[PDB]
Design an enzyme around this catalytic site. Structure first.
Site, PDB file in Angstrom:
ATOM      1  CB  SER A 186       0.916  41.188  48.783  1.00 43.80           C
ATOM      2  OG  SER A 186      -0.307  41.784  49.215  1.00 43.80           O
ATOM      3  CG  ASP A 245       1.566  40.377  56.589  1.00 37.26           C
ATOM      4  OD1 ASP A 245       0.469  41.026  56.416  1.00 37.26           O
ATOM      5  OD2 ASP A 245       2.295  39.966  55.654  1.00 37.26           O
ATOM      6  CG  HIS A 299       1.228  42.912  53.661  1.00 39.39           C
ATOM      7  ND1 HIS A 299       1.340  41.539  53.487  1.00 39.39           N
ATOM      8  CD2 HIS A 299       0.787  43.411  52.473  1.00 39.39           C
ATOM      9  CE1 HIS A 299       0.954  41.237  52.285  1.00 39.39           C
ATOM     10  NE2 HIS A 299       0.655  42.347  51.599  1.00 39.39           N
TER      11      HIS A 299
END
Ligand SMILES: *[C@@H]1O[C@H](CO)[C@@H](O)[C@H](O)[C@H]1NC(C)=O
EC number: 3.1.1.3
Length: 311
Positions: A186, A245, A299
């Site tokens: 991330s 994602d 994600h």
């Protein structure tokens, strides 16, 4: 403190890879919420090679490190006490950080069996809120003339940089044949990219032969000039993207950002299948093929490991 930027490694150096899919895949259902035009909650789908088992196991290991960094026992605890910490429990934890302003959580660890110095960056402590609130602010990337990155990523790395680099280079001086590997999920993957570049720019002893970058769910960090600079470093760079994602699609390429780093696109978990787009700049042929039908939920798990909550 920090060793100086090396001129030969900071020398200044494309089409939109999302545009075909944005053209083909048509509009989202009206019930789908978006961020920068990319679905937050679409529920379906609208060279190249398949990675081998060994490749997948390697990507899973770095995912595990990234995932374990969200455990407060690991950062700031400096202990391997968590659900997937059995995988990494032999590593010596050298130092951890939890910075004041930008909440940058990071660690340096060393594996003597692995002959590897590991640098791990945590993502946000509140991922959904981080995605919702993302606002992109292109600014000069100070090391390399004519390139731009998002300011917030520079801010996140800059607050931990001076101490972290000093720690890494001390370890590297002591273990000169060890590899240095940088990972994050991330936001942590953006920080990890900036860190790998910084190590390359400041340590002559690191190069493509012994400096590696792995990221999971990493957003775009800078413009095409930046991306081209990253390719010019030759740093082995494996950028993993899980299914639909959203975050690897933010900011969207149409806004003038571009990925470097070979894409490893997980397309199935039963069995684990990874499609590799074998280009150093991103392509239209892996996850960029499914925009805008993206998902926040994709994600939050990579290779069956929860990424962002230590569970
Ligand atoms: C997406 O989220 C919005 C807002 O929370 C909601 O109104 C909508 O039902 C969701 N759609 C899907 C497909 O999950």
């Amino acid at each position: 403190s920090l060793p100086p930027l090396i001129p030969s490694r900071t020398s200044a150096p494309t089409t939109d890879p999302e545009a075909p899919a944005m053209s083909r895949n048509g509009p989202l259902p009206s019930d789908v919420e978006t961020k920068y035009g990319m679905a937050l909650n679409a529920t379906s789908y609208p060279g190249i090679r398949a990675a081998t088992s060994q490749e997948i196991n390697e990507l899973t290991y770095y995912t595990t490190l990234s995932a374990n960094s969200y455990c407060r026992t690991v950062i700031p605890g400096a202990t391997w006490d968590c659900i997937h910490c059995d995988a990494t429990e032999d590593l010596k934890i050298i130092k951890t950080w939890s910075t004041l302003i930008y909440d940058t959580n990071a660690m340096v660890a060393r594996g003597d069996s692995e002959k590897t110095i590991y640098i791990v960056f945590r993502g946000s402590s509140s991922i959904r809120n981080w995605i919702a609130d993302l606002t992109f602010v292109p600014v000069s990337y100070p090391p390399v003339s004519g390139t731009k990155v998002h300011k917030g990523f520079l801010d996140s790395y800059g607050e931990v940089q001076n101490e972290l680099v000093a720690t890494v280079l001390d370890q590297f001086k002591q273990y000169p044949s060890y590899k240095v590997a940088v990972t994050g999920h991330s936001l942590g993957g953006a920080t990890a990219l900036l860190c790998a570049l910084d190590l390359y720019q400041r340590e002559e002893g690191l190069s493509s032969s012994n400096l590696f970058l792995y990221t999971q769910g990493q957003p775009r960090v800078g413009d095409p000039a930046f991306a081209n600079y990253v390719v010019s470093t030759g740093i082995p760079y494996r950028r993993t993207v899980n299914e639909r994602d959203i975050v690897p699609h933010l900011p969207p390429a149409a806004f003038g950002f571009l990925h470097a780093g070979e894409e490893y696109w997980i397309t199935d978990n039963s069995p684990e299948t990874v499609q590799v787009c074998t280009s150093d700049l991103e392509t239209s042929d892996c996850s960029n093929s499914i925009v805008p039908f993206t998902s926040v939920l994709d994600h939050l798990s990579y290779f069956g490991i929860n990424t962002g909550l230590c569970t």
